Amino acid sequence: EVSQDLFNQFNLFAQYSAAAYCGKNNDAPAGTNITCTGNACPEVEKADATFLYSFEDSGVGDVTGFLALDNTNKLIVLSFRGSRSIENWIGNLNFDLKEINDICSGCRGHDGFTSSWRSVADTLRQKVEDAVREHPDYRVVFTGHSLGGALATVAGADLRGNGYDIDVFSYGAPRVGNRAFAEFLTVQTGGTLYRITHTNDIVPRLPPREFGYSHSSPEYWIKSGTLVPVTRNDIVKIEGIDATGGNNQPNIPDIPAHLWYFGLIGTCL
């Protein structure tokens, strides 16, 4: 239901997202190679991919991940890790909103997600910008899983419009703000958000719509099961803000479904 090229980008940024959970990838020497224990990121390894920047327990919400260089694919990749204990994080997640007129007028964002990005935003922008002037033909890509896919999206909405486009690939990301924010994220130019969800993963169902949260459109929804290899016929593109039909269905959600986006994700030590 999506093109093969789109499947391959989807597949490739899942593995970048996965690679941010391995502890070696959070405090590594720049110019060094991005690798994963457990075969979590073979596509990244197949490209000549090295650390530009490396960060662990940064600022306000322990922002962890890496800035990568990909010469084979010609990419500048900002990858944010999700929580080191997802189950604990799902259960303690607050639904508190805050206004973010900085980004867009009338818009509100999750206080936790918003603040955490704000914490590390200046530095990380410097680091991306330096890569851009240095590799001006390279494409900027922000990505992440779980709480990292939220950070990617928010950082993507924040940094766009500065001379370079920014695509965002998020895997099992929670909702990130109210309706005006979701609307804003749907139409914003200067890059494309590819919001990826798996079957009945809980995380994209929080915070609840009852607390004033909405999801941007479109939605790329993976219909193949947990531990089941994904093909391109298993990803259906679901349009419309707050649409039903993909992840947002009235049925009982699941945790293991969150940890299977093309292969294992969030379990790299």
Side-chain angles (χ1 to χ4, degrees):
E1 352 271 2
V2 302
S3 80
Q4 181 69 40
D5 169 275
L6 197 44
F7 167 93
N8 289 323
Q9 297 192 59
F10 278 180
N11 182 46
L12 173 72
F13 297 123
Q15 308 190 3
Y16 273 115
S17 277
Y21 290 89
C22 327
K24 135 170 186 162
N25 303 342
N26 312 140
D27 269 331
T32 277
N33 69 166
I34 299 164
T35 67
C36 310
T37 46
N39 197 57
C41 70
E43 289 297 314
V44 179
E45 284 191 5
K46 171 149 75 63
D48 165 45
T50 43
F51 283 95
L52 285 173
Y53 186 55
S54 230
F55 49 93
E56 176 147 56
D57 300 336
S58 239
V60 155
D62 294 348
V63 184
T64 304
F66 64 78
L67 180 58
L69 189 55
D70 186 334
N71 296 301
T72 312
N73 300 300
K74 315 191 161 191
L75 302 175
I76 300 183
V77 179
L78 177 60
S79 166
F80 304 83
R81 192 237 250 169
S83 153
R84 170 38 79 219
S85 176
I86 304 168
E87 265 148 4
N88 197 247
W89 174 80
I90 290 150
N92 284 284
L93 187 69
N94 104 339
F95 305 150
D96 278 333
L97 278 166
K98 92 185 213 219
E99 90 205 1
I100 49 158
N101 295 310
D102 357 296
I103 309 176
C104 48
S105 156
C107 303
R108 312 183 70 210
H110 180 273
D111 190 288
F113 310 157
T114 281
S115 285
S116 177
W117 163 249
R118 180 97 265 98
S119 223
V120 301
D122 273 316
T123 294
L124 292 177
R125 170 162 64 146
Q126 187 259 338
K127 267 101 168 54
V128 165
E129 259 153 45
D130 294 341
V132 170
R133 47 181 224 349
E134 182 73 3
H135 315 268
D137 50 330
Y138 288 27
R139 154 172 184 230
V140 180
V141 169
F142 294 2
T143 192
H145 170 262
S146 216
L147 165 62
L151 297 167
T153 303
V154 165
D158 195 15
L159 305 201
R160 271 166 178 164
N162 251 104
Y164 53 100
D165 287 346
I166 306 181
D167 288 358
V168 178
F169 300 71
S170 56
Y171 302 78
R175 304 184 178 85
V176 86
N178 75 343
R179 215 97 159 290
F181 196 32
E183 286 168 333
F184 176 76
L185 292 159
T186 298
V187 294
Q188 180 196 33
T189 58
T192 307
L193 158 60
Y194 295 91
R195 181 177 81 70
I196 301 161
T197 72
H198 184 226
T199 54
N200 63 332
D201 180 1
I202 184 153
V203 175
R205 274 128 98 143
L206 301 169
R209 298 265 282 123
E210 289 76 7
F211 288 81
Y213 286 76
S214 256
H215 259 310
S216 62
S217 175
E219 167 179 1
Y220 293 84
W221 177 54
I222 309 168
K223 300 180 294 154
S224 53
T226 293
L227 292 174
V228 178
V230 184
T231 71
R232 45 175 261 264
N233 303 112
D234 301 322
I235 310 181
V236 173
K237 185 185 198 201
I238 290 149
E239 317 198 72
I241 285 188
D242 285 323
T244 58
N247 179 253
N248 185 27
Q249 291 184 43
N251 63 15
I252 158 94
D254 184 69
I255 293 163
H258 186 47
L259 310 176
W260 187 264
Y261 277 87
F262 295 93
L264 263 341
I265 188 163
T267 62
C268 203
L269 271 13

